[PDB]
Amino acid sequence: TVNLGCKLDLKTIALRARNAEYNPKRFAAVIMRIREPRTTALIFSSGKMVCTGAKSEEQSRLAARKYARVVQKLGFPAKFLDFKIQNMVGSCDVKFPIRLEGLVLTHQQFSSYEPELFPGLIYRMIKPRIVLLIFVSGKVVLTGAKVRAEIYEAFENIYPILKGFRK
DNA sequence: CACGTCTGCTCGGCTCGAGTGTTCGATCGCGACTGAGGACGAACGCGCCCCCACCCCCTTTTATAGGCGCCCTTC
């Protein structure tokens, strides 16, 4: 997220902008999307904006600055204030099938495998407090992170266990 | 002025109305044994409306995947 520091007129924005859309009857924020690092932003009337989609923190800082740029170019007193990363998402694969019934058995306290509902196992780490999604093919997705190290650490913890249930 | 007669006032007798109290239909309240031989559950219960306080839901991005609805195509 980032705060622009001033109030704006989203309808004018919607009118001016070329890569945006606005619908008060649907949602309050105006939606913008740029090809740079290919991203999307949520701009509030309050002066707050949210930026998602970047594949690195520098490019997200880059994209947000680019958004602040087009807002300036509209004639508005944009300010790059209070920039902060709120979440990071990662994934990887291990290339082998795995034992999930066992994993949920041996980690009952954390796991919440629901094969009926969502196909993969939901694992809630409490180290760098991270949420993982593990699938039978071996693919793994991670979220809840604030820095890359938490992903490597959370994965560094889970990888031996997973190899240990290899089929 | 004196005596007799007519008219008006007072004492007494009578009528009427209010007051006090009896009779009688009507309503209401209370009581009615012994013991067999057990047999196990049934559920809620002015409601609605206003105020208000707090927490949920809508959107977007992405890899990941079993599930599934729509529709095009073929039999």
UniProtKB/Swiss-Prot annotation:
Localization annotation: Nucleus
**Extent of the sequence repeats:** 1-71, 85-162
Q: In which tissues is it expressed?
A: Widely expressed, with levels highest in the testis and ovary.
Q: Where does DNA bind?
A: R33, K48, N87, R124
Protein role: The TFIID basal transcription factor complex plays a major role in the initiation of RNA polymerase II (Pol II)-dependent transcription. TFIID recognizes and binds promoters with or without a TATA box via its subunit TBP, a TATA-box-binding protein, and promotes assembly of the pre-initiation complex (PIC). The TFIID complex consists of TBP and TBP-associated factors (TAFs), including TAF1, TAF2, TAF3, TAF4, TAF5, TAF6, TAF7, TAF8, TAF9, TAF10, TAF11, TAF12 and TAF13. The TFIID complex structure can be divided into 3 modules TFIID-A, TFIID-B, and TFIID-C.
Spell out the family assignment given in the record's similarity comment.
Belongs to the TBP family.
Subunit comment = Binds DNA as monomer. Component of the TFIID basal transcription factor complex, composed of TATA-box-binding protein TBP, and a number of TBP-associated factors (TAFs), including TAF1, TAF2, TAF3, TAF4, TAF5, TAF6, TAF7, TAF8, TAF9, TAF10, TAF11, TAF12 and TAF13. Part of a TFIID-containing RNA polymerase II pre-initiation complex that is composed of TBP and at least GTF2A1, GTF2A2, GTF2E1, GTF2E2, GTF2F1, GTF2H2, GTF2H3, GTF2H4, GTF2H5, GTF2B, TCEA1, ERCC2, ERCC3, TAF1, TAF2, TAF3, TAF4, TAF5, TAF6, TAF7, TAF8, TAF9, TAF10, TAF11, TAF12 and TAF13. (Microbial infection) Interacts with HIV-1 Tat.
Record disease entry:
Spinocerebellar ataxia 17: Spinocerebellar ataxia is a clinically and genetically heterogeneous group of cerebellar disorders. Patients show progressive incoordination of gait and often poor coordination of hands, speech and eye movements, due to degeneration of the cerebellum with variable involvement of the brainstem and spinal cord. SCA17 is an autosomal dominant cerebellar ataxia (ADCA) characterized by widespread cerebral and cerebellar atrophy, dementia and extrapyramidal signs. The molecular defect in SCA17 is the expansion of a CAG repeat in the coding region of TBP.
Instruction: Supply the name of the protein.
Output: TATA-box-binding protein
User: Which species is listed as the source?
Assistant: Homo sapiens (Human)
Question: What high-level taxonomic lineage is stated for the organism?
Answer: Eukaryota, Metazoa, Chordata, Craniata, Vertebrata
Full-length numbering of the shown residues: 171 to 337 of 339
